[PDB]
């Protein structure tokens, strides 16, 4: 984006939005629970626990 | 149920390496996500993680014991080994085994905690307990038993075998100056139970491998 | 990583109290969540309160709740009884050092309770030890609340405080305090002394025993 | 896991392979090419440059 | 037609900011995953990389120089733009606009450089060049061909271009690399071998430009007889 | 992060010359795969030769290219022509650093040309320059092969090294090399000495020429 990369942080299936990110990488975490699979948004490539799935990627709008 | 029993030396030389087991009833040491690992307690100290391994052999380990840390387990048997090398007096303290019931992430679950093994880092050798009687309202009187100069720390007391539960209370130890430590146990009985019921106490030194029975008449 | 946990909270019977542990985003602000709150008794194995994403854990009453905001959680007990007084501890996880992580602890003081009046029980150096020319005079206090007592020993009628060595209070399982003070000389000591007596002042009250050879 | 985290490295749609990894974490990268999606598997979460999809997981044989 | 143009000072003072503009013909300046941005090359040094900004807008700075560098770009303007603050002498150099041609992932595509625009970081200012010229009895490279040239003698900063007969003569041509003397000021020469049966027919002119100092000095070789 | 490479490279014409640049996993070996060489005449900007995954550039001949073993890439040079003489350079880019990195460069030497004898052209202050009280005398050699040779100043006729510099040689459009070497003096130094001569050394031949001051 013009001022960092745009990332969206939408969780799971919400409505998709983005943010402004001073990380040149943007990641969409996924896990299970008893209400199902849970995806969660953002920029950078966080450290995950063991049963999460990470994935990230660097391009504007990649982590969807 | 879940069981979580520790077993191993009391006292280990600060030239050796601590090995521990436990044994684990009632939770799986098989999941991906769930751990079975060591916490530990130093006196005047806080809660410090050891380290964990999980269903799938994979060991995290606390990045300051690292080192000198190595945590294994035998499914077949259901239990989990620790052993920590390079010894100091720093690793005196009581090693709490623990499991984590997680099921679909890390730490997603209950944890259950075992009774613990107090382990002493010592050049010194084991020291067995001296127990001497304690005996001197007028509807019931307190007597009790004082174990004296032991070392380490781990005593354990019953009365009667266990069979006398009410009234009873043992205390905290102390460390004299002689450098061993001292703990009295006491427990109130009616007045009228003096002559005709039998009063006795089970000291138990782990460390000395000794169990002592003492009568208390006065 | 780094917990920080109040050192010690009080609070009355009844009332609603909160202790509070501070971390990053690494460990408790991490997602999805877990803080683990565990209750331990000084000189037992800790209990778990609260795991995982604030989840009560099974056999904990009601009154125990955990929740997180950012990189804080808190635990709160609403209504807090006497059987609550204990050191509580807070655990998290943290990803950037895959390891986890504990707080300093929390000393909760539940105070409020019925006061008790000391029993003491004063005995004499057995006839063994002095046997081994040593000599322990034991006083035991039980059964007192609030907490806090002080014990002084006298050597024959005036307070004397050589090798007196007392240990904190700990509850009973009635729910009172106990505490013993050890009295240690040498059995000639001992044997010349005219009277050793064990004092306690809890509540005001002042409750003296005394035992001569 | 005996000795280590077990991991897929098998490459885009080849028969799974599986090495076991000092690492506590697996990856799968994805990228595109004229031939069209490439995958590429193995052990640790190592970063990429931009335009490869990183996917990384912490338990045996999750890269798939 | 790929072409990547580079303009601005070649003189900056060591307490100002460097900007250099980079024109853009060819190139698309929106693909995510391709870049365009800077390299330097300072004198007897290697090739070090200033930075990049990609189709996004996502900048990668050379950590080095991450806290003085910031690229930007106009993509109406198909133009990107580099700035470095916190001058040096070491930041004296030739910097080069770059462009990557990639189309999958970062640098998986043909990279296009520009001709390179020559700074200089000096408290010092322009000095234009006088153009001495060199003819010589002794200048007899054959025997059917004599060699005449033109000195260009004390100028800075460095960047200097020569010609002869405004490009028209080529053949036989040869410009030397330059020299510091103990002035402070650089010197070069250039040459070109001529027919001798042409000294008295045809004209030679060289023509030295100077552009930190705007200045273009044409010089006609004049062989005259004593 | 740090590729290196080879400082020099040399090779004889036809023969085939590898140039090689060592790097780490995070920057070379990183996977899909990216290293650039490209070519520099000194003194004119850079062309890519090899980029991306070891792919030839648009109108590089077909002798030039490029491979990548584990963390090691490689140019390769195949039939090396007088025209390749020239500084290579390989570039990575590094995701630990997200930064591209740059080798220090190597030159890659082309030998086993046709002889060549250096042609001496020295030329005396101008007179302009000498309305100043400065003197230059100028001393071009061209059309040489190989490259290297020695220059010698001379006063009168004896050797002198002060306020003497030459440039290092630098090839022509033809093919060949040449040099400059600049004697500076006063004005009353250039007019009071009675022959300054400039001496090429190459190959074992001496080839000299002389000037003298003149009031022209």
């Known amino acids: 984006g013009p001022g960092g990369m745009i990332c969206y942080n939408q969780q799971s299936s919400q409505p998709p939005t983005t943010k402004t990110c001073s990380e040149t990488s943007c990641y969409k975490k996924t896990w299970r629970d008893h209400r199902g699979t849970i995806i969660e948004r953002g920029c950078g490539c966080p450290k995950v626990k063991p049963g999460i799935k990470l994935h990230c990627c660097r391009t504007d709008k990649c982590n969807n | 149920q879940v069981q979580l029993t520790e077993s191993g030396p009391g006292l280990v030389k600060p030239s050796q390496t601590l090995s521990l087991t436990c044994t684990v009833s009632g939770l799986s040491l098989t999941n991906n996500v769930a751990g079975s690992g060591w916490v530990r307690q130093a006196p005047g100290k806080g809660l410090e993680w050891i380290g964990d391994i999980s269903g799938d052999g994979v060991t995290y380990y606390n990045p300051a014991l690292k080192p000198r840390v190595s945590i294994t387990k035998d499914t077949s048997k259901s239990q989990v080994y620790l052993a920590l090398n390079r010894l100091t007096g720093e690793d005196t303290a009581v090693?709490?085994?623990?499991?984590?019931?997680?099921?679909?992430?890390?730490?997603?679950?209950?944890?259950?905690?075992?009774?613990g093994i107090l382990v002493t880092v010592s050049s010194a050798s084991t020291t067995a307990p001296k127990v001497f009687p304690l005996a001197s309202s007028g509807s019931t009187v307190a007597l009790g038993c004082l174990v004296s100069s032991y070392f380490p720390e781990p005593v354990t007391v019953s009365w009667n075998s266990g069979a006398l539960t009410s009234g009873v209370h043992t205390f905290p130890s102390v460390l004299q100056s002689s450098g061993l430590y001292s703990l009295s146990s006491m427990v109130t009985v009616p007045a009228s139970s003096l002559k005709s019921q039998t009063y006795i106490c089970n000291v138990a030194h782990p460390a000395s491998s000794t169990k002592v029975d003492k009568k208390i008449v006065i | 990583q780094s917990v920080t946990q109040p050192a010690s909270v009080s609070g009355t019977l009844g009332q609603t109290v909160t202790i509070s542990c501070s971390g990053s985003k690494s460990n408790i602000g991490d997602t999805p969540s877990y803080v683990g709150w565990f209750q331990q008794i000084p000189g037992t194995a800790p209990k778990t309160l609260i795991y995982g994403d604030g989840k009560r854990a099974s056999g904990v009453p009601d009154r125990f709740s955990g929740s997180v905001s950012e990189n804080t959680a808190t635990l709160t007990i609403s209504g807090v009884q006497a059987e609550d007084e204990a050191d509580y501890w807070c655990a998290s996880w943290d990803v950037n050092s895959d390891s986890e992580v504990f707080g300093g602890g929390t000393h909760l003081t539940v105070a409020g309770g019925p006061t008790s009046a000391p029993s003491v029980s004063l005995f004499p150096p057995s006839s063994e030890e002095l046997s081994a020319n040593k000599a322990t005079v034991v006083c035991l206090i039980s059964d007192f609340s609030p907490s806090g007592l002080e014990v002084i020993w006298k050597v024959n009628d005036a307070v004397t405080n050589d090798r007196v060595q007392t240990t904190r209070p700990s509850k009973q399982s009635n729910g009172k305090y106990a505490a013993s003070s050890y009295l240690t000389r040498t059995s000639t000591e001992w044997k010349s002394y005219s009277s050793v007596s064990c004092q306690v002042k809890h509540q005001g009250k002042t409750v003296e025993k005394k035992l001569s050879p | 896991g005996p000795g280590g985290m077990i991991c897929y490295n098998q490459q885009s749609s080849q028969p799974p392979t599986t090495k076991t990894c000092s690492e506590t974490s697996c990856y799968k990268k994805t990228w595109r090419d004229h031939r069209g999606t490439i995958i590429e598997r193995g052990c640790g979460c190592p970063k990429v440059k931009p335009g490869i999809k990183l996917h990384c997981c912490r338990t045996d044989k999750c890269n798939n | 037609q790929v072409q990547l143009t580079e303009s601005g000072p070649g003189l900056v003072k060591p307490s100002q900011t460097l900007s250099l503009t980079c024109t853009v013909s060819g190139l698309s300046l929106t693909n995510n995953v391709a870049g365009s941005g800077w390299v330097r090359q300072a004198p007897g040094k290697g090739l070090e990389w200033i930075g990049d900004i990609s189709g996004d807008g996502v900048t990668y700075y050379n950590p080095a120089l991450k806290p003085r560098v910031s690229i930007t770009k106009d993509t109406s303007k198909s133009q990107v733009y580099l700035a470095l603050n916190r001058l040096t002498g070491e930041d004296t150099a030739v910097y080069y606009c770059?462009?990557?041609?990639?189309?999958?992932?970062?640098?998986?595509?043909?990279?296009?450089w520009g001709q390179g625009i020559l700074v200089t970081v000096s408290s010092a200012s322009t000095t234009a060049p006088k153009v001495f010229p060199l003819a010589s009895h002794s200048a007899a490279t054959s025997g059917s061909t004599v060699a005449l040239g033109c000195l260009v003698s004390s100028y800075f900063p460095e960047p200097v271009t020569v010609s002869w007969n405004s490009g028209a003569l080529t053949s036989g041509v040869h410009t030397f690399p330059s020299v510091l003397q103990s002035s402070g000021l650089y010197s070069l020469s250039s040459m070109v071998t001529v027919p001798a049966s042409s000294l008295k027919s045809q004209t030679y002119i060289c023509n030295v430009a100077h552009p930190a100092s705007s200045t273009k000095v044409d010089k006609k070789i004049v062989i005259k007889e004593c | 992060q740090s590729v290196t490479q080879p400082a020099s490279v040399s090779g004889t014409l036809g023969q085939t010359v590898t140039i090689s640049c060592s790097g780490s996993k995070s920057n070379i070996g990183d996977t899909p795969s990216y290293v650039g060489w490209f070519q520099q005449i000194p003194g004119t900007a850079p062309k890519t030769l090899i980029y991306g995954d070891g792919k030839r550039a648009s109108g590089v001949p077909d002798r030039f290219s490029g491979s990548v073993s584990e963390n090691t890439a490689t140019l390769t040079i195949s039939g090396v022509q007088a025209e390749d003489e020239a500084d290579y350079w390989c570039a990575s880019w590094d995701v630990n650093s997200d930064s591209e990195v740059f080798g220090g460069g190597t030159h890659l030497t082309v030998a086993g040309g046709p002889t060549s004898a250096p042609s001496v052209s020295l030329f005396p202050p101008s007179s302009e320059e000498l309305s100043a009280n400065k003197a230059t005398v100028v001393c071009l050699i061209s059309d040489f092969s190989p490259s290297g040779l020695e220059v010698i100043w001379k006063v009168n006729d004896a050797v002198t090294n002060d306020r003497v510099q030459t440039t290092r040689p630098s090839k022509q459009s033809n093919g060949k090399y040449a040099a400059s070497s600049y004697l500076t003096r006063t004005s009353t130094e250039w007019k009071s000495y009675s022959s300054v001569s400039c001496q090429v050394k190459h190959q074992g031949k001496t080839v000299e020429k002389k000037l003298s001051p003149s009031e022209c």
């Open positions: 770059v462009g990557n041609a990639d189309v999958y992932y970062w640098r998986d595509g043909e990279k296009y």
